[PDB]
Every structure is written in structure tokens, then in C-alpha cells.
Ligand binder design. Structure first.
Ligand SMILES: [Mg+2]
Ligand SMILES: [Mg+2]
Lengths: 234, 138
RNA sequence: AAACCGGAUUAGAUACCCGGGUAGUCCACGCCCUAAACGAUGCGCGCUAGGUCUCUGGGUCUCCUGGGGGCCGAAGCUAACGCGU
RNA sequence: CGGUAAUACGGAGGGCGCGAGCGUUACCCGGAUUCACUGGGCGUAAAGGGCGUGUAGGCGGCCUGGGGCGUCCCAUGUGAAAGACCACGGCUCAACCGUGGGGGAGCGUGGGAUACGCUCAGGCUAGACGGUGGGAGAGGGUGGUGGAAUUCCCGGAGUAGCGGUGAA
């Protein structure tokens, strides 16, 4: 189910904060706003999903990023709802590019997995039960979706690339294909497979980002429900 | 007044390609056309056609690029890397056939105007005539 | 208010501060022709994303479209600082 | 470089380089795209004229026709020898020399081309100028006039200081 499902509540977004490189994917300045030509949305979807498919059934790992305010959660849903890695709270200087080092944080996160369930089940110089169980605190918060990922992904999926630029940069540096949902905010030129959409409305992120995860599990057989995601959707 | 029309064209073209435009008008002249023909034939432009704008004769020039590109900065290679005026109203430049230049060991062109018409350098060399050395292009 | 005449200050003070004061500052006419006379950026024309503030025209007056003044800054340029319809 | 540990001075051992030579000085080109034609620059490095007006000059939109000056092409004459370059030769080699061959711009003559530049003749309206109608402006010149303030002068009322400074 696609087509008018998109016009559902998810077409055009921002106005007069545009990138004129995005002028190709626009329908009009109707009532002050940029409303985004959907025929070409759909157009780009086929090519993009086509890439996802092939990538997925060839057994690839996509890396999902959405640190954005109201995308935050509907990421770690569909990301985990497909066993793919995700970056949720904040992108870090050189997850990809400084990958080896940023990994020793995960290498050392699960050292503390294995100190919870431990012979030190309740022991070690008692003020070290915040000193270390608050190290695992931060480690937890950030590397929760990143922890799976043990070689660079074969792709990345991004919700707002002008928001998420520090990532996309690393991607392109590393020849890693950039998949993203992008609106009039953004610079198409450096998004390899674009979902000309709406970086913002939670429904729009949902419709799109879930289907893409359908396609992913569905390209290893075993489709499920209407997705464990409708947040407080409101 | 616009003092070197042919400079103009080369420049319009140089300019439009570095922002990867699909096309550029240039106000039309028979001579301009003759140069375009070469560009087209030598495979530098897709092609060109006459058109009007505000009802005055122009020449739409359809430009041509490489494929989308590797890593950070996906900008296509240029097909027209270099397009430069040689002869100019300030200083006219003429060559005998024995002294027509060879552009980038042949991987490039030099449009050049003769009394046997406008020609690439190999063209001119073959018909053993020289003339006004218009521009190089590689 | 240069100069200059005094009062302070100071190691001294041909200065800074204070009290006076002529040329000059003003006008007309005739000279002089200089400057950090600066955007330290000669003049004209064509081409090359945009955003926002502003002065002044026109339109079918959300806006669109000329001509000035600004800032941010595509592409690009620059030793850098910056420049950037 | 040298101020008491000098691979930099002087000497010595050793070493590098060239060799009937080796160094020095002078002068020329080079590198020096450091006068930049090839091949440079001028916001802050040196460099935009204080600004205009416009003389000579330089440069000149689109179309068509003539001419063929520039420009291009073919032929031809000229470009002595030496030298240069290539060959093969003579002095035992080489230097030196002989013989032969091949370059060659520039200019003259004859013939040809006409795209671009030039020129003559026609044509267009995209540059420029003009017309009608509207606008904003501390743009300039001349005359006139307004209020605030300072200074002096005259009158009133009024008493012992005012002024000025970091303090005086
Ligand atoms: Mg220089
Ligand atoms: Mg200077």
C-alpha cells in the first residue's frame, strides 16, 4: 500500500529555508510553503527500495540514523524490528571514520554487561558502584544500537541529512552508500538514493521508515504486522 | 556593447558547465553556429538548436557531463575541461598550416577558422590550410 | 583657536590640565591643487545558487518585477584575511 | 664562523674533486615566469591616476552582397662561401681538414581561397540615443526668512563670591 497513502499526511514540508538544488523535486509555493512533487517522490522510492532490496537479500547491514527530536523513537523501533543497527541520541565524531577506536567503547561496554551478572555481583570499593555503574550509564545511552554493527555498514539510512550531515560526510568519505529521507532543507547531490519526502512530520517518518523495514525482513521472508510503532503518535 | 561575441560564447559555456547546467542560451550568430557544429561533432556538447527568447534569435546549447562520481563530492567529471580563446580583438592570432598547434597530444581540439571554412586542427591540417586560431578546447 | 601671554604639573615640561589671546575659522572676488582625495578595489559590457534587512518606482499588490543601500554567504577565487549578481 | 674543547681560523693526518693543469678576478647568457610575446602583477605585500569631460589612438552588435588590404594556400626566383646539422672520407685517433646531402625564416614574381579581420554598398533592432507619462533625493547656484544658544550692551531686582581642577 503506497501512492495516496503518501498524500495521506506526508507530502511537502519547509518554506524559504530551502536549498535550490532541491528545486527539481518541488511542485509549488502554494500558500507560502514548498509542496513537494509526489509523482517524483514515488519515482525515487522504486529506485531506492530496489537498492534496499538487493542490498538486504544479499544479506547486507544498513545503519539507521535519526538523532532528530521526533524521529528518535520511531527509529529504534524499525531498526530493531529488523535487527539492523541504529544511532539514536547523538552522532559521534567518527563512528564510521574513527570506527576502530569508537568501537573500543562497545568492546568495553559489554565488559560491564559482564560485571552486572558477575562474581562482583555486589562487590568492589563501594563508591565505585556509581564510578563504574555510571560509566555503563552513558555507554548504554549511546551505543545501544551501535553495539551490533561490528564492521562498517554497506549502507546508511538517514532521516534529515542536513540535520545529520556529520554522518553523511563520513559515509561519502568512506564510499558507503547514503540512503535518506530528505526535504527542501537538503542538498540532494550527496544523497545516493533519495527519498524526497518530509524530514519532520512523525507520520511521514513512520509511513516511510517502516515500509523500508518491511522490504528488509520481507527480503528474507516472514512479514509481520502494522509495526510496533504508533508511539504516542499525537 | 559586448566586444567579443565568440569569447562570450566560450565563457557562457565555461560558466554553465561548472554549475552543471543542462543548457545555456547564447545570442545567435552564423559564426557562433559554425563553432557549435564542431563542438557537437567532436562530442563536447550533446548538441544545440535555434530558439527565440523575447523573440530574438538565440542558440540553446545542450551540455554533456560524465557519470555521477565516487566519494565525498559526487560531481561528474566535465566533458569540456578547458575552453579558451586564443585569437582576440585585442590581439588577432593566425597560423600557417605548418604551425597549427597540436592540442594535448591530440586528446584535445583547436577550432580554427580558414578560407575553406571553420575547422578542427586535424581537419585543417588535412586540407592543408591555416587561418585564425579561434580557441583551444580539451 | 596655531602662535603668543600667564597659572598649574613635572626631575625638566619649550606638552598633556587651567585662565587669557592674534592669525585663522565667516563672506566676496582672485590664487594654491594637496590628502588615510580610502572600498587603500579605474571605466564599460556579458556570464555564473540562494537567504534576509532596507531606500525608491511599477504590477494582476501572499507577492511579482526594475533601480540603489546592507549583511550572510552556491559555484569559484585568495598567501591568508577575505571576496562572493 | 672565532668570547678556552672550533669538522668554518692556522697546521697536521686522513678525505673529496680535477689533472699539465688547478684556482682567482673581470665580463656575457642561464637559472630569473625577477620587464612575464611564449610567460607576471596592482584590497592589506611594490603598484588604480583625487574626480570628471572628452582629442588622437585602441577596440566594435545581427544579416546580405561586392572588393581581396590583413590572413591562408600552390608554384617560382632569392637566401654566396665559411659556420651549423647528417653522412661518408684524409692526417695511426682526435682536434683540424675534404666531399656530398638536408634544413631555412624574410623578401620578389605568378596563380588561387574568402571563414575571420579590413573596406565599399545595402538591410535589421537585441547596444546607444530620443519621445510621452509618472517618481524619490542634504545634487548645485542666488536671493530671502526662522527659532534655540553663546558673547557684548541697556534696564530691573539682588549679595559675596564666581569660575575652574586630581588638588589648585
Ligand atoms: Mg610579481
Ligand atoms: Mg600598497
Amino acid at each position: 500500500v503506497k501512492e495516496l497513502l503518501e498524500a495521506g499526511v506526508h507530502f511537502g514540508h519547509e518554506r524559504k529555508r530551502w536549498n535550490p538544488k532541491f528545486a527539481r523535486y518541488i511542485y509549488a509555493e502554494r500558500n507560502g510553503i514548498h509542496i513537494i512533487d509526489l509523482q517524483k517522490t514515488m519515482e525515487e522510492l522504486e529506485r531506492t527500495f530496489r537498492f534496499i532490496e538487493d542490498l538486504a537479500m544479499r544479506g547486507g547491514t544498513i545503519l539507521f540514523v535519526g538523532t532528530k527530536k521526533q524521529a528518535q523513537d520511531i527509529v529504534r523501533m524499525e531498526a530493531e524490528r529488523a535487527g539492523m543497527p541504529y544511532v539514536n541520541q547523538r552522532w559521534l565524531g567518527g563512528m564510521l571514520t574513527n570506527f576502530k577506536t569508537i568501537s573500543q567503547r562497545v568492546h568495553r561496554l559489554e565488559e560491564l554487561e559482564a560485571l552486572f551478572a558477575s562474581p562482583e555481583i555486589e562487590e568492589r570499593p563501594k563508591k565505585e558502584q556509581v564510578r563504574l555503574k555510571h560509566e555503563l550509564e552513558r555507554l548504554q545511552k549511546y551505543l545501544s544500537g551501535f553495539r551490533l554493527l561490528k564492521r562498517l555498514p554497506d549502507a546508511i539510512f538517514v532521516v534529515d541529512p542536513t540535520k545529520e550531515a556529520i554522518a553523511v560526510r563520513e559515509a561519502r568519505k568512506l564510499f558507503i552508500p547514503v540512503i535518506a529521507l530528505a526535504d527542501t532543507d537538503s542538498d540532494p547531490d550527496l544523497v545516493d538514493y533519495i527519498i524526497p519526502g518530509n524530514d519532520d512530520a512523525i507520520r511521514s517518518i513512520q509511513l516511510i521508515l517502516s515500509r523500508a523495514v518491511d522490504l528488509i525482513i520481507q527480503a528474507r521472508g516472514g512479514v509481520v504486522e502494522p509495526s510496533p510503532s504508533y508511539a504516542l503518535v499525537q | 556593447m559586448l566586444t567579443d561575441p565568440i569569447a562570450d560564447m566560450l565563457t557562457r559555456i565555461r560558466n554553465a558547465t561548472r554549475v552543471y547546467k543542462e543548457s545555456t542560451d547564447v545570442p545567435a550568430s552564423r559564426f557562433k553556429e559554425e563553432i557549435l557544429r564542431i563542438l557537437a561533432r567532436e562530442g563536447f556538447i550533446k548538441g544545440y538548436e535555434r530558439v527565440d527568447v523575447d523573440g530574438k534569435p538565440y542558440l540553446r546549447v545542450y551540455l554533456k557531463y560524465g557519470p555521477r562520481r565516487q566519494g565525498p563530492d559526487p560531481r561528474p567529471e566535465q566533458v569540456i575541461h578547458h575552453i579558451r580563446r586564443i585569437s582576440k580583438p585585442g590581439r588577432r592570432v593566425y597560423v600557417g598550416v605548418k604551425e597549427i598547434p597540436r592540442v594535448r597530444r591530440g586528446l584535445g581540439i583547436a577550432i580554427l577558422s580558414t578560407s575553406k571554412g571553420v575547422l578542427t586542427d586535424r581537419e585543417a591540417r588535412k586540407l592543408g590550410v591555416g587561418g585564425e586560431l579561434i580557441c583551444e578546447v580539451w
